Amino acid sequence: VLPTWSLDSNGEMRSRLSLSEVLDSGDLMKFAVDKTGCQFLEKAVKGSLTSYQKFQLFEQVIGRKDDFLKLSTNIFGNYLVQSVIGISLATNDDGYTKRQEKLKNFISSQMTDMCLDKFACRVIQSSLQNMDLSLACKLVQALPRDARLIAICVDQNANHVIQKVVAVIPLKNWEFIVDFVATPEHLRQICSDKYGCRVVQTIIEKLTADSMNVDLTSAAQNLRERALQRLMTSVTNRCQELATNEYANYIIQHIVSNDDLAVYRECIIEKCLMRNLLSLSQEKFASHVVEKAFLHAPLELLAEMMDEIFDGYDALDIMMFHQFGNYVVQCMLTICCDAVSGRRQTKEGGYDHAISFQDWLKKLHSRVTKERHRLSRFSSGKKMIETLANLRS
RNA sequence: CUGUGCCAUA
């Protein structure tokens, strides 16, 4: 516990306990890994520190490699470490340069381990955010380029490091992570993980020419475009596997749903969805994807999808009554109703596809009518019937 | 007869 010298007869930290007392004693490490003492320290180091208090603080908390790692990997001490790092960055004295270089080197030498650690990942994250960019880019360069990078992308802790890097580091400096991830085997592994798939979405988002990248110069936009194509190529080459997977389906969905990735939406729809609609519609995971394809397909593609269901080598009956498929039919139905009722754009390329939508609606209404008695036996079926009843409202 | 995730420190 906390050094005898620091306590009451009742074993309480003597109020009037000073930062300097702790720094002089050589016992800072004991307080920093204690819940109560750490809170004292964090309050203490936020005060007005003299030049020499900082000297001692810097040396004891971010100046010795082993203590630095011990505190960074500690449940309380990690907070103190981040706090001292910030003070170090706000202290424009002489040793400013040497201090940061050391810190950077301590961290680099243990990058993976610190990234994978519940508490040191927090030190990593705040360092990437707060260090001068040039230094921060050096932490990024310390990332493994082997199997360990996968481990990080899929770790509950370390995935946030990678996400932090995508938020605050220039693309030039992490381009390699993109190409690492677009590796068929890496793409496979990473998109199939509950943390990996968020990570991969976050990269795609950063790589997207949306309204959050309007500040990019033409150069930055070109670099961004190239990286996006490399990743999209890999992703489309495997859309079937990705679209049907329990985690990856969210990525396929994101892409299909995004107008700023229209062209990739279309590749996917053609690559793995088209001519597999009936099959994918009956799948737990890929059925949500099918819904998104119907909801976002350009009208000419939409027509091919509709025809596939109505008169593709019945399909409509299997889906209408399948545990998953039924959501697809409902979605088809809502799409056609909205279209007829002005809620949904029916023009594309200078031509109205209104008659097509009206043909699709006729087919659906006619089927629902004949299958009514049976559809009313089910929740899904009663919803279709209402959707149709609300048209006549 | 209803159908999927992650968003993590005292």
Contact between A268 and A232 (Cβ < 8 Å): no
Alpha-carbon gap, residue A151 to A199, rounded angstroms: 12
Angstrom CA distances, A278 to A44, A159, A270, stand at: 66, 36, 14
Say which amino acid occupies A3. Answer: P
Residue closest to B4 C1′ by Cα: A285
- HEC sequence for chain A: CCCHHHECCCCCECCCCCHHHHHHHCCHHHHHCCHHHHHHHHHHCCCCCCHHHHHHHHHHHHCCHHHHHHHHCCCCHHHHHHHHHHHHHCCCCCCHHHHHHHHHHHHHHCHHHHHHCCCHHHHHHHHHHHCCHHHHHHHHHCCCCCHHHHHHHCCCCCHHHHHHHHHHCCHHHHHHHHHHHCCHHHHHHHHCCCCHHHHHHHHHHHCCCCCCCCCCCHHHHHHHHHHHHHHHHHHHHCHHHHHHCCCCHHHHHHHHHCHHHHHHHHHHHHHHHCCCHHHHCCCCCHHHHHHHHHHHCCHHHHHHHHHHHHHCCCHHHHHHCCCCHHHHHHHHHHHHHHHHCCCCCCEECCEECHHHHHHHHHHHHHHHHHCHHHHCCCHHHHHHHHHHHCCCC
**Which amino acid, one-letter code, is at A315?**
A
Pair A267, A228: CB distance under 8 Å: no
Radius of gyration of chain A (CA): 29
Residue among A297, A299, A291 at smallest CA distance from A269: A297
| Spatial separation of the C-alpha atoms in residues A24 and A5, rounded to whole Å | 12
Of A215, A207, A301, which Cα lies nearest the Cα of A260?
Answer: A207
Tokens (6 digits) for A24: 């002089």
Torsion of CA A253, A254, A259, A260, to 10 degrees: -140
Distance CA A139, CA A59 (A): 21
Closest CA to B3 C1' — which residue? A324
State the residue range of the domain holding A354: 1-393
Total tally of structural domains belonging to chain A: 1
Q: Do the beta carbons of residue A68 and residue A78 sit within 8 Å?
A: no
Resolution of the structure, angstroms: 2.5
Cβ of A250 near strand B (under 7 Å)? The reply is: yes
Inter-helix orientation angle A286-296/A325-340, to 10°:
10
Using the structure, give the distance in angstroms from the CA atom of A383 to the C1' atom of B3, rounded to a whole number: 15
The gap between A91 CA and B8 C1' (Å) is 31
- Residues in contact with A141: Cβ distance below 8 Å, sequence separation at least 6, in sequence order: A108, A173
Q: How far, in Å, CA of A239 to CA of A87, rounded?
A: 48
- Inter-residue contact A185 to A237 (CB < 8 Å): no
How many Å apart are A74 CA and B10 C1'? 11
CB atoms within 10 A of CB A307: 13
**Pairwise CA distance, residues A104 & A154, whole Å:** 24
Show which positions of strand B are touched by protein (CB under 7 A): 1-10
Strand B contacts (CB < 7 A) among A residues 167-186? none
Spatial distance from the CA of A282 to the C1' of B4 (Å): 14
Return d(Cα A78, Cα A82) in angstroms, integer. 6
How far apart are the C-alpha atoms of A150 and A141, rounded to whole Å? Answer: 16
Please, are residues A371 and A320 in contact by the beta-carbon 8 Å criterion? Answer: yes
**Does residue A291 lie within 7 Å of nucleic acid chain B, judged by its CB?**
yes
Q: Are A111 and A142 in contact (CB under 8 A)?
A: yes
- What CATH number does the domain containing A258 carry? 1.25.10.10
A203 Cβ neighbours under 8 A, 6+ residues apart: A166, A177, A178, A181, A231
CB-CB contact of A103 with A61 (8 Å) = no
Residue A38 Cβ under 7 A from any strand B atom? yes
Sign of the four-CA dihedral A128, A131, A133, A136: negative
Q: Is the CB of A247 under 7 A from strand B?
A: yes
Q: How many residues does chain A have?
A: 393
Q: State how far the Cα of A32 lies from the Cα of A74, in Å rounded to an integer.
A: 9
Cα–Cα distance measured from residue A332 to residue A337, given in angstroms and rounded to the nearest whole number = 9
Q: Is residue A186 within 8 Å of A150, Cβ to Cβ?
A: yes
